[PDB]
């Protein structure tokens, strides 16, 4: 397995949750469909990803979607000349800015 780097590196500042085991390495953590950072000492190094779209372009939790477009806009038209459009989760900004990074890692 292997999701992405933004799904690990750009995870969350303290999730108090893990998706691996104490003493892991990484690959084995990235092969279990889980992510691994460790960057944060003490907290859970091995955790889960942060998917939010069928395309590794959005990626973001209910809060990282800022709020590009409007909750009144629709699909197609959104991505038309707006930003990401993940309505998968109602009650949030579907039209949000793109990760616009790529400086993520494992």
mmCIF file of N, CA, C and O in Angstrom:
data_model
loop_
_atom_site.group_PDB
_atom_site.id
_atom_site.type_symbol
_atom_site.label_atom_id
_atom_site.label_comp_id
_atom_site.label_asym_id
_atom_site.label_seq_id
_atom_site.Cartn_x
_atom_site.Cartn_y
_atom_site.Cartn_z
ATOM 1 N N UNK A 1 0.830 -1.192 0.000
ATOM 2 C CA UNK A 1 0.000 0.000 0.000
ATOM 3 C C UNK A 1 0.874 1.255 0.000
ATOM 4 O O UNK A 1 2.098 1.164 0.083
ATOM 5 N N UNK A 2 0.212 2.399 -0.096
ATOM 6 C CA UNK A 2 0.913 3.671 -0.109
ATOM 7 C C UNK A 2 -0.019 4.758 -0.651
ATOM 8 O O UNK A 2 -0.234 4.850 -1.858
ATOM 9 N N UNK A 3 -0.559 5.575 0.293
ATOM 10 C CA UNK A 3 -1.462 6.650 -0.076
ATOM 11 C C UNK A 3 -0.697 7.819 -0.699
ATOM 12 O O UNK A 3 -0.598 7.922 -1.920
ATOM 13 N N UNK A 4 -0.174 8.673 0.170
ATOM 14 C CA UNK A 4 0.580 9.830 -0.280
ATOM 15 C C UNK A 4 1.471 10.328 0.861
ATOM 16 O O UNK A 4 1.584 9.673 1.896
ATOM 17 N N UNK A 5 2.078 11.483 0.634
ATOM 18 C CA UNK A 5 2.956 12.076 1.629
ATOM 19 C C UNK A 5 2.186 13.144 2.409
ATOM 20 O O UNK A 5 2.439 13.355 3.593
ATOM 21 N N UNK A 6 1.263 13.788 1.711
ATOM 22 C CA UNK A 6 0.454 14.830 2.324
ATOM 23 C C UNK A 6 -0.537 14.167 3.282
ATOM 24 O O UNK A 6 -1.071 14.820 4.178
ATOM 25 N N UNK A 7 -0.754 12.878 3.060
ATOM 26 C CA UNK A 7 -1.672 12.120 3.893
ATOM 27 C C UNK A 7 -0.984 11.697 5.192
ATOM 28 O O UNK A 7 -1.639 11.224 6.120
ATOM 29 N N UNK A 8 0.328 11.882 5.217
ATOM 30 C CA UNK A 8 1.111 11.526 6.388
ATOM 31 C C UNK A 8 1.743 12.800 6.950
ATOM 32 O O UNK A 8 1.353 13.271 8.019
ATOM 33 N N UNK A 9 2.706 13.324 6.207
ATOM 34 C CA UNK A 9 3.394 14.535 6.617
ATOM 35 C C UNK A 9 2.377 15.622 6.969
ATOM 36 O O UNK A 9 2.400 16.168 8.072
ATOM 37 N N UNK A 10 1.504 15.905 6.013
ATOM 38 C CA UNK A 10 0.480 16.916 6.208
ATOM 39 C C UNK A 10 -0.776 16.290 6.817
ATOM 40 O O UNK A 10 -1.881 16.492 6.317
ATOM 41 N N UNK A 11 -0.564 15.541 7.889
ATOM 42 C CA UNK A 11 -1.664 14.883 8.573
ATOM 43 C C UNK A 11 -2.398 15.878 9.476
ATOM 44 O O UNK A 11 -3.192 16.685 8.999
ATOM 45 N N UNK A 12 -2.104 15.785 10.764
ATOM 46 C CA UNK A 12 -2.725 16.666 11.739
ATOM 47 C C UNK A 12 -1.774 16.864 12.920
ATOM 48 O O UNK A 12 -1.030 15.954 13.281
ATOM 49 N N UNK A 13 -1.833 18.089 13.507
ATOM 50 C CA UNK A 13 -0.986 18.419 14.641
ATOM 51 C C UNK A 13 -1.494 17.746 15.918
ATOM 52 O O UNK A 13 -2.133 18.389 16.750
ATOM 53 N N UNK A 14 -1.193 16.461 16.033
ATOM 54 C CA UNK A 14 -1.611 15.696 17.193
ATOM 55 C C UNK A 14 -2.975 15.059 16.915
ATOM 56 O O UNK A 14 -3.990 15.751 16.874
ATOM 57 N N UNK A 15 -2.953 13.747 16.731
ATOM 58 C CA UNK A 15 -4.175 13.010 16.457
ATOM 59 C C UNK A 15 -4.435 12.021 17.597
ATOM 60 O O UNK A 15 -5.483 11.381 17.641
ATOM 61 N N UNK A 16 -3.460 11.927 18.490
ATOM 62 C CA UNK A 16 -3.570 11.028 19.626
ATOM 63 C C UNK A 16 -4.094 9.664 19.173
ATOM 64 O O UNK A 16 -4.658 8.916 19.970
ATOM 65 N N UNK A 17 -3.889 9.380 17.895
ATOM 66 C CA UNK A 17 -4.333 8.119 17.327
ATOM 67 C C UNK A 17 -3.200 7.510 16.500
ATOM 68 O O UNK A 17 -2.377 8.233 15.939
ATOM 69 N N UNK A 18 -3.191 6.186 16.452
ATOM 70 C CA UNK A 18 -2.171 5.471 15.702
ATOM 71 C C UNK A 18 -2.843 4.442 14.789
ATOM 72 O O UNK A 18 -4.009 4.101 14.985
ATOM 73 N N UNK A 19 -2.078 3.976 13.813
ATOM 74 C CA UNK A 19 -2.584 2.994 12.871
ATOM 75 C C UNK A 19 -1.486 1.958 12.622
ATOM 76 O O UNK A 19 -1.463 1.311 11.575
ATOM 77 N N UNK A 20 -0.602 1.832 13.600
ATOM 78 C CA UNK A 20 0.496 0.885 13.500
ATOM 79 C C UNK A 20 0.839 0.296 14.870
ATOM 80 O O UNK A 20 -0.053 -0.015 15.657
ATOM 81 N N UNK A 21 2.135 0.162 15.112
ATOM 82 C CA UNK A 21 2.608 -0.383 16.373
ATOM 83 C C UNK A 21 3.903 0.301 16.815
ATOM 84 O O UNK A 21 4.588 0.923 16.006
ATOM 85 N N UNK A 22 4.206 0.160 18.135
ATOM 86 C CA UNK A 22 5.406 0.757 18.694
ATOM 87 C C UNK A 22 6.653 -0.032 18.287
ATOM 88 O O UNK A 22 6.837 -1.170 18.715
ATOM 89 N N UNK A 23 7.474 0.604 17.466
ATOM 90 C CA UNK A 23 8.697 -0.024 16.995
ATOM 91 C C UNK A 23 8.680 -0.191 15.475
ATOM 92 O O UNK A 23 9.602 -0.765 14.899
ATOM 93 N N UNK A 24 7.619 0.322 14.869
ATOM 94 C CA UNK A 24 7.469 0.236 13.426
ATOM 95 C C UNK A 24 8.666 0.909 12.751
ATOM 96 O O UNK A 24 9.522 1.479 13.426
ATOM 97 N N UNK A 25 8.687 0.820 11.431
ATOM 98 C CA UNK A 25 9.766 1.413 10.658
ATOM 99 C C UNK A 25 9.216 2.477 9.704
ATOM 100 O O UNK A 25 9.658 3.625 9.728
ATOM 101 N N UNK A 26 8.262 2.056 8.887
ATOM 102 C CA UNK A 26 7.648 2.959 7.928
ATOM 103 C C UNK A 26 6.976 2.157 6.812
ATOM 104 O O UNK A 26 5.751 2.045 6.774
ATOM 105 N N UNK A 27 7.806 1.619 5.931
ATOM 106 C CA UNK A 27 7.308 0.831 4.817
ATOM 107 C C UNK A 27 6.175 -0.075 5.304
ATOM 108 O O UNK A 27 5.067 -0.031 4.773
ATOM 109 N N UNK A 28 6.494 -0.876 6.311
ATOM 110 C CA UNK A 28 5.516 -1.790 6.877
ATOM 111 C C UNK A 28 4.270 -1.024 7.326
ATOM 112 O O UNK A 28 3.174 -1.584 7.369
ATOM 113 N N UNK A 29 4.478 0.243 7.650
ATOM 114 C CA UNK A 29 3.385 1.092 8.094
ATOM 115 C C UNK A 29 2.681 1.656 6.859
ATOM 116 O O UNK A 29 1.474 1.887 6.880
ATOM 117 N N UNK A 30 3.466 1.859 5.811
ATOM 118 C CA UNK A 30 2.933 2.391 4.569
ATOM 119 C C UNK A 30 2.364 1.273 3.693
ATOM 120 O O UNK A 30 1.725 1.540 2.676
ATOM 121 N N UNK A 31 2.617 0.045 4.118
ATOM 122 C CA UNK A 31 2.138 -1.115 3.387
ATOM 123 C C UNK A 31 0.868 -1.669 4.035
ATOM 124 O O UNK A 31 0.198 -2.526 3.464
ATOM 125 N N UNK A 32 0.577 -1.156 5.221
ATOM 126 C CA UNK A 32 -0.602 -1.589 5.955
ATOM 127 C C UNK A 32 -1.763 -0.626 5.694
ATOM 128 O O UNK A 32 -2.775 -0.666 6.392
ATOM 129 N N UNK A 33 -1.578 0.215 4.688
ATOM 130 C CA UNK A 33 -2.596 1.186 4.327
ATOM 131 C C UNK A 33 -2.608 2.360 5.308
ATOM 132 O O UNK A 33 -3.494 3.212 5.253
ATOM 133 N N UNK A 34 -1.612 2.368 6.182
ATOM 134 C CA UNK A 34 -1.495 3.424 7.173
ATOM 135 C C UNK A 34 -0.306 4.309 6.795
ATOM 136 O O UNK A 34 0.560 3.896 6.026
ATOM 137 N N UNK A 35 -0.302 5.511 7.355
ATOM 138 C CA UNK A 35 0.767 6.458 7.085
ATOM 139 C C UNK A 35 1.731 6.445 8.274
ATOM 140 O O UNK A 35 1.417 5.888 9.326
ATOM 141 N N UNK A 36 2.883 7.065 8.067
ATOM 142 C CA UNK A 36 3.893 7.132 9.109
ATOM 143 C C UNK A 36 4.730 8.408 8.981
ATOM 144 O O UNK A 36 5.273 8.692 7.916
ATOM 145 N N UNK A 37 4.803 9.142 10.083
ATOM 146 C CA UNK A 37 5.563 10.379 10.106
ATOM 147 C C UNK A 37 6.635 10.293 11.194
ATOM 148 O O UNK A 37 7.825 10.203 10.891
ATOM 149 N N UNK A 38 6.178 10.323 12.437
ATOM 150 C CA UNK A 38 7.084 10.251 13.570
ATOM 151 C C UNK A 38 7.625 11.644 13.898
ATOM 152 O O UNK A 38 7.912 11.945 15.055
ATOM 153 N N UNK A 39 7.749 12.455 12.858
ATOM 154 C CA UNK A 39 8.252 13.808 13.022
ATOM 155 C C UNK A 39 7.880 14.350 14.403
ATOM 156 O O UNK A 39 8.666 15.063 15.026
ATOM 157 N N UNK A 40 6.684 13.988 14.843
ATOM 158 C CA UNK A 40 6.198 14.430 16.139
ATOM 159 C C UNK A 40 6.535 13.371 17.191
ATOM 160 O O UNK A 40 5.935 12.297 17.211
ATOM 161 N N UNK A 41 7.519 13.719 18.063
ATOM 162 C CA UNK A 41 7.943 12.811 19.116
ATOM 163 C C UNK A 41 6.912 12.763 20.245
ATOM 164 O O UNK A 41 6.398 13.798 20.668
ATOM 165 N N UNK A 42 6.640 11.549 20.703
ATOM 166 C CA UNK A 42 5.679 11.351 21.776
ATOM 167 C C UNK A 42 4.325 10.904 21.222
ATOM 168 O O UNK A 42 3.775 9.894 21.659
ATOM 169 N N UNK A 43 3.826 11.678 20.269
ATOM 170 C CA UNK A 43 2.546 11.374 19.652
ATOM 171 C C UNK A 43 2.687 10.121 18.787
ATOM 172 O O UNK A 43 3.767 9.539 18.701
ATOM 173 N N UNK A 44 1.550 9.732 18.149
ATOM 174 C CA UNK A 44 1.538 8.558 17.291
ATOM 175 C C UNK A 44 2.228 8.846 15.957
ATOM 176 O O UNK A 44 1.777 9.695 15.190
ATOM 177 N N UNK A 45 3.313 8.123 15.722
ATOM 178 C CA UNK A 45 4.071 8.288 14.494
ATOM 179 C C UNK A 45 3.274 7.646 13.355
ATOM 180 O O UNK A 45 3.077 8.261 12.309
ATOM 181 N N UNK A 46 2.839 6.419 13.600
ATOM 182 C CA UNK A 46 2.068 5.688 12.608
ATOM 183 C C UNK A 46 0.586 6.003 12.823
ATOM 184 O O UNK A 46 0.034 5.719 13.886
ATOM 185 N N UNK A 47 -0.016 6.588 11.797
ATOM 186 C CA UNK A 47 -1.423 6.945 11.860
ATOM 187 C C UNK A 47 -2.120 6.662 10.528
ATOM 188 O O UNK A 47 -1.577 5.961 9.676
ATOM 189 N N UNK A 48 -3.313 7.223 10.391
ATOM 190 C CA UNK A 48 -4.090 7.039 9.177
ATOM 191 C C UNK A 48 -3.884 8.244 8.257
ATOM 192 O O UNK A 48 -3.396 9.286 8.694
ATOM 193 N N UNK A 49 -4.277 8.058 6.969
ATOM 194 C CA UNK A 49 -4.141 9.118 5.985
ATOM 195 C C UNK A 49 -5.205 10.199 6.189
ATOM 196 O O UNK A 49 -5.911 10.195 7.196
ATOM 197 N N UNK A 50 -5.285 11.097 5.219
ATOM 198 C CA UNK A 50 -6.250 12.180 5.280
ATOM 199 C C UNK A 50 -6.878 12.377 3.898
ATOM 200 O O UNK A 50 -6.781 13.455 3.316
ATOM 201 N N UNK A 51 -7.525 11.288 3.401
ATOM 202 C CA UNK A 51 -8.169 11.331 2.099
ATOM 203 C C UNK A 51 -9.477 12.123 2.159
ATOM 204 O O UNK A 51 -10.070 12.268 3.226
ATOM 205 N N UNK A 52 -9.886 12.616 0.999
ATOM 206 C CA UNK A 52 -11.112 13.390 0.906
ATOM 207 C C UNK A 52 -11.423 13.670 -0.565
ATOM 208 O O UNK A 52 -11.862 14.766 -0.913
ATOM 209 N N UNK A 53 -11.183 12.661 -1.391
ATOM 210 C CA UNK A 53 -11.433 12.787 -2.816
ATOM 211 C C UNK A 53 -10.805 11.610 -3.569
ATOM 212 O O UNK A 53 -9.853 10.998 -3.088
ATOM 213 N N UNK A 54 -11.364 11.332 -4.736
ATOM 214 C CA UNK A 54 -10.873 10.240 -5.561
ATOM 215 C C UNK A 54 -9.595 10.661 -6.291
ATOM 216 O O UNK A 54 -9.040 9.890 -7.072
ATOM 217 N N UNK A 55 -9.165 11.883 -6.009
ATOM 218 C CA UNK A 55 -7.965 12.414 -6.629
ATOM 219 C C UNK A 55 -7.054 13.029 -5.564
ATOM 220 O O UNK A 55 -7.497 13.851 -4.763
ATOM 221 N N UNK A 56 -5.799 12.607 -5.590
ATOM 222 C CA UNK A 56 -4.822 13.107 -4.637
ATOM 223 C C UNK A 56 -4.466 14.560 -4.953
ATOM 224 O O UNK A 56 -3.295 14.889 -5.140
ATOM 225 N N UNK A 57 -5.496 15.391 -5.003
ATOM 226 C CA UNK A 57 -5.307 16.801 -5.294
ATOM 227 C C UNK A 57 -5.938 17.659 -4.196
ATOM 228 O O UNK A 57 -5.451 18.749 -3.898
ATOM 229 N N UNK A 58 -7.012 17.136 -3.625
ATOM 230 C CA UNK A 58 -7.715 17.840 -2.566
ATOM 231 C C UNK A 58 -7.017 17.533 -1.240
ATOM 232 O O UNK A 58 -6.248 18.350 -0.736
ATOM 233 N N UNK A 59 -7.311 16.354 -0.711
ATOM 234 C CA UNK A 59 -6.721 15.930 0.547
ATOM 235 C C UNK A 59 -6.879 17.045 1.582
ATOM 236 O O UNK A 59 -6.339 18.137 1.410
ATOM 237 N N UNK A 60 -7.624 16.733 2.632
ATOM 238 C CA UNK A 60 -7.861 17.695 3.694
ATOM 239 C C UNK A 60 -9.051 17.276 4.560
ATOM 240 O O UNK A 60 -10.016 16.703 4.057
ATOM 241 N N UNK A 61 -8.944 17.581 5.845
ATOM 242 C CA UNK A 61 -10.000 17.242 6.784
ATOM 243 C C UNK A 61 -11.042 18.363 6.836
ATOM 244 O O UNK A 61 -10.836 19.435 6.270
ATOM 245 N N UNK A 62 -12.140 18.075 7.521
ATOM 246 C CA UNK A 62 -13.214 19.044 7.655
ATOM 247 C C UNK A 62 -12.701 20.265 8.420
ATOM 248 O O UNK A 62 -12.960 20.408 9.613
ATOM 249 N N UNK A 63 -11.983 21.116 7.700
ATOM 250 C CA UNK A 63 -11.433 22.320 8.296
ATOM 251 C C UNK A 63 -10.303 22.867 7.421
ATOM 252 O O UNK A 63 -10.032 24.068 7.429
ATOM 253 N N UNK A 64 -9.675 21.962 6.685
ATOM 254 C CA UNK A 64 -8.582 22.339 5.805
ATOM 255 C C UNK A 64 -9.148 22.765 4.449
ATOM 256 O O UNK A 64 -8.415 23.262 3.594
ATOM 257 N N UNK A 65 -10.446 22.552 4.294
ATOM 258 C CA UNK A 65 -11.119 22.908 3.055
ATOM 259 C C UNK A 65 -11.429 24.405 3.030
ATOM 260 O O UNK A 65 -12.136 24.882 2.142
ATOM 261 N N UNK A 66 -10.886 25.107 4.014
ATOM 262 C CA UNK A 66 -11.096 26.542 4.116
ATOM 263 C C UNK A 66 -12.518 26.877 3.663
ATOM 264 O O UNK A 66 -13.468 26.741 4.433
ATOM 265 N N UNK A 67 -12.620 27.311 2.415
ATOM 266 C CA UNK A 67 -13.911 27.668 1.851
ATOM 267 C C UNK A 67 -13.697 28.561 0.625
ATOM 268 O O UNK A 67 -13.781 29.784 0.723
ATOM 269 N N UNK A 68 -13.426 27.914 -0.498
ATOM 270 C CA UNK A 68 -13.200 28.634 -1.739
ATOM 271 C C UNK A 68 -14.556 29.072 -2.294
ATOM 272 O O UNK A 68 -14.990 30.201 -2.063
ATOM 273 N N UNK A 69 -15.188 28.159 -3.015
ATOM 274 C CA UNK A 69 -16.487 28.437 -3.605
ATOM 275 C C UNK A 69 -17.540 28.680 -2.522
ATOM 276 O O UNK A 69 -17.208 29.074 -1.404
ATOM 277 N N UNK A 70 -18.788 28.434 -2.890
ATOM 278 C CA UNK A 70 -19.892 28.621 -1.964
ATOM 279 C C UNK A 70 -20.687 27.325 -1.788
ATOM 280 O O UNK A 70 -20.636 26.441 -2.642
ATOM 281 N N UNK A 71 -21.422 27.252 -0.646
ATOM 282 C CA UNK A 71 -22.226 26.080 -0.348
ATOM 283 C C UNK A 71 -23.493 26.050 -1.206
ATOM 284 O O UNK A 71 -24.369 25.211 -0.998
ATOM 285 N N UNK A 72 -23.549 26.976 -2.152
ATOM 286 C CA UNK A 72 -24.695 27.067 -3.042
ATOM 287 C C UNK A 72 -24.313 26.663 -4.469
ATOM 288 O O UNK A 72 -25.184 26.438 -5.308
ATOM 289 N N UNK A 73 -23.010 26.584 -4.700
ATOM 290 C CA UNK A 73 -22.504 26.212 -6.009
ATOM 291 C C UNK A 73 -22.684 24.706 -6.212
ATOM 292 O O UNK A 73 -22.914 23.971 -5.254
ATOM 293 N N UNK A 74 -22.573 24.293 -7.466
ATOM 294 C CA UNK A 74 -22.722 22.888 -7.808
ATOM 295 C C UNK A 74 -21.407 22.345 -8.367
ATOM 296 O O UNK A 74 -20.406 23.056 -8.412
ATOM 297 N N UNK A 75 -21.453 21.053 -8.791
ATOM 298 C CA UNK A 75 -20.277 20.405 -9.347
ATOM 299 C C UNK A 75 -20.000 20.898 -10.768
ATOM 300 O O UNK A 75 -20.786 21.659 -11.331
ATOM 301 N N UNK A 76 -18.878 20.445 -11.309
ATOM 302 C CA UNK A 76 -18.486 20.831 -12.654
ATOM 303 C C UNK A 76 -18.239 22.340 -12.723
ATOM 304 O O UNK A 76 -17.145 22.778 -13.071
ATOM 305 N N UNK A 77 -19.276 23.091 -12.386
ATOM 306 C CA UNK A 77 -19.187 24.542 -12.406
ATOM 307 C C UNK A 77 -18.153 24.998 -11.374
ATOM 308 O O UNK A 77 -17.441 25.977 -11.595
ATOM 309 N N UNK A 78 -18.103 24.268 -10.271
ATOM 310 C CA UNK A 78 -17.167 24.585 -9.206
ATOM 311 C C UNK A 78 -15.746 24.448 -9.755
ATOM 312 O O UNK A 78 -15.051 25.445 -9.944
ATOM 313 N N UNK A 79 -15.358 23.206 -10.000
ATOM 314 C CA UNK A 79 -14.033 22.925 -10.525
ATOM 315 C C UNK A 79 -13.822 23.720 -11.816
ATOM 316 O O UNK A 79 -12.699 23.825 -12.308
ATOM 317 N N UNK A 80 -14.919 24.261 -12.325
ATOM 318 C CA UNK A 80 -14.868 25.043 -13.549
ATOM 319 C C UNK A 80 -13.842 26.166 -13.389
ATOM 320 O O UNK A 80 -12.846 26.210 -14.111
ATOM 321 N N UNK A 81 -14.118 27.047 -12.439
ATOM 322 C CA UNK A 81 -13.231 28.167 -12.175
ATOM 323 C C UNK A 81 -13.264 28.531 -10.689
ATOM 324 O O UNK A 81 -13.420 29.700 -10.336
ATOM 325 N N UNK A 82 -13.114 27.510 -9.859
ATOM 326 C CA UNK A 82 -13.125 27.708 -8.419
ATOM 327 C C UNK A 82 -11.968 26.927 -7.793
ATOM 328 O O UNK A 82 -10.806 27.300 -7.949
ATOM 329 N N UNK A 83 -12.327 25.857 -7.098
ATOM 330 C CA UNK A 83 -11.332 25.020 -6.447
ATOM 331 C C UNK A 83 -11.917 23.615 -6.289
ATOM 332 O O UNK A 83 -12.953 23.301 -6.873
ATOM 333 N N UNK A 84 -11.226 22.807 -5.498
ATOM 334 C CA UNK A 84 -11.664 21.443 -5.257
ATOM 335 C C UNK A 84 -13.158 21.468 -4.932
ATOM 336 O O UNK A 84 -13.686 22.492 -4.502
ATOM 337 N N UNK A 85 -13.798 20.329 -5.151
ATOM 338 C CA UNK A 85 -15.223 20.207 -4.887
ATOM 339 C C UNK A 85 -15.561 18.820 -4.336
ATOM 340 O O UNK A 85 -15.979 17.938 -5.083
ATOM 341 N N UNK A 86 -15.369 18.672 -3.033
ATOM 342 C CA UNK A 86 -15.649 17.407 -2.375
ATOM 343 C C UNK A 86 -16.849 17.560 -1.437
ATOM 344 O O UNK A 86 -16.691 17.946 -0.280
ATOM 345 N N UNK A 87 -18.021 17.251 -1.971
ATOM 346 C CA UNK A 87 -19.246 17.349 -1.196
ATOM 347 C C UNK A 87 -19.423 16.075 -0.366
ATOM 348 O O UNK A 87 -20.330 15.990 0.459
ATOM 349 N N UNK A 88 -18.540 15.118 -0.614
ATOM 350 C CA UNK A 88 -18.588 13.854 0.100
ATOM 351 C C UNK A 88 -19.059 14.071 1.539
ATOM 352 O O UNK A 88 -19.746 13.223 2.106
ATOM 353 N N UNK A 89 -18.673 15.214 2.088
ATOM 354 C CA UNK A 89 -19.048 15.554 3.450
ATOM 355 C C UNK A 89 -19.902 16.823 3.438
ATOM 356 O O UNK A 89 -19.390 17.919 3.214
ATOM 357 N N UNK A 90 -21.224 16.628 3.687
ATOM 358 C CA UNK A 90 -22.155 17.742 3.706
ATOM 359 C C UNK A 90 -22.000 18.566 4.987
ATOM 360 O O UNK A 90 -21.730 18.014 6.053
ATOM 361 N N UNK A 91 -22.178 19.870 4.840
ATOM 362 C CA UNK A 91 -22.061 20.772 5.972
ATOM 363 C C UNK A 91 -20.635 21.317 6.073
ATOM 364 O O UNK A 91 -20.188 21.701 7.152
ATOM 365 N N UNK A 92 -19.959 21.331 4.933
ATOM 366 C CA UNK A 92 -18.593 21.821 4.879
ATOM 367 C C UNK A 92 -18.341 22.468 3.516
ATOM 368 O O UNK A 92 -19.155 22.337 2.602
ATOM 369 N N UNK A 93 -17.181 23.173 3.418
ATOM 370 C CA UNK A 93 -16.814 23.841 2.181
ATOM 371 C C UNK A 93 -16.329 22.834 1.138
ATOM 372 O O UNK A 93 -15.185 22.384 1.185
ATOM 373 N N UNK A 94 -17.226 22.507 0.217
ATOM 374 C CA UNK A 94 -16.905 21.561 -0.838
ATOM 375 C C UNK A 94 -15.884 22.219 -1.770
ATOM 376 O O UNK A 94 -14.887 21.602 -2.140
ATOM 377 N N UNK A 95 -16.170 23.464 -2.122
ATOM 378 C CA UNK A 95 -15.291 24.213 -3.003
ATOM 379 C C UNK A 95 -14.170 24.823 -2.160
ATOM 380 O O UNK A 95 -14.315 25.924 -1.631
ATOM 381 N N UNK A 96 -13.078 24.078 -2.059
ATOM 382 C CA UNK A 96 -11.933 24.532 -1.288
ATOM 383 C C UNK A 96 -10.676 24.596 -2.158
ATOM 384 O O UNK A 96 -10.610 23.956 -3.206
ATOM 385 N N UNK A 97 -9.712 25.375 -1.692
ATOM 386 C CA UNK A 97 -8.461 25.531 -2.415
ATOM 387 C C UNK A 97 -7.684 24.214 -2.458
ATOM 388 O O UNK A 97 -7.806 23.387 -1.556
ATOM 389 N N UNK A 98 -6.883 24.056 -3.547
ATOM 390 C CA UNK A 98 -6.087 22.852 -3.719
ATOM 391 C C UNK A 98 -4.875 22.857 -2.784
ATOM 392 O O UNK A 98 -4.348 23.917 -2.451
ATOM 393 N N UNK A 99 -4.471 21.659 -2.386
ATOM 394 C CA UNK A 99 -3.333 21.512 -1.496
ATOM 395 C C UNK A 99 -2.207 22.475 -1.880
ATOM 396 O O UNK A 99 -1.519 23.008 -1.012
ATOM 397 N N UNK A 100 -2.056 22.666 -3.182
ATOM 398 C CA UNK A 100 -1.026 23.556 -3.692
ATOM 399 C C UNK A 100 0.225 23.466 -2.814
ATOM 400 O O UNK A 100 0.556 24.412 -2.102
ATOM 401 N N UNK A 101 0.884 22.319 -2.894
ATOM 402 C CA UNK A 101 2.089 22.094 -2.116
ATOM 403 C C UNK A 101 2.997 21.114 -2.862
ATOM 404 O O UNK A 101 3.726 21.508 -3.771
ATOM 405 N N UNK A 102 2.924 19.857 -2.452
ATOM 406 C CA UNK A 102 3.729 18.818 -3.069
ATOM 407 C C UNK A 102 5.071 18.686 -2.346
ATOM 408 O O UNK A 102 5.906 17.867 -2.725
ATOM 409 N N UNK A 103 5.235 19.505 -1.318
ATOM 410 C CA UNK A 103 6.462 19.490 -0.539
ATOM 411 C C UNK A 103 6.292 18.546 0.653
ATOM 412 O O UNK A 103 6.964 18.698 1.672
ATOM 413 N N UNK A 104 5.391 17.589 0.486
ATOM 414 C CA UNK A 104 5.124 16.619 1.534
ATOM 415 C C UNK A 104 6.175 15.510 1.441
ATOM 416 O O UNK A 104 7.015 15.521 0.544
ATOM 417 N N UNK A 105 6.092 14.581 2.382
ATOM 418 C CA UNK A 105 7.026 13.468 2.417
ATOM 419 C C UNK A 105 6.465 12.357 3.307
ATOM 420 O O UNK A 105 5.294 12.387 3.681
ATOM 421 N N UNK A 106 7.328 11.401 3.620
ATOM 422 C CA UNK A 106 6.934 10.282 4.458
ATOM 423 C C UNK A 106 7.668 10.318 5.801
ATOM 424 O O UNK A 106 8.325 11.304 6.127
#
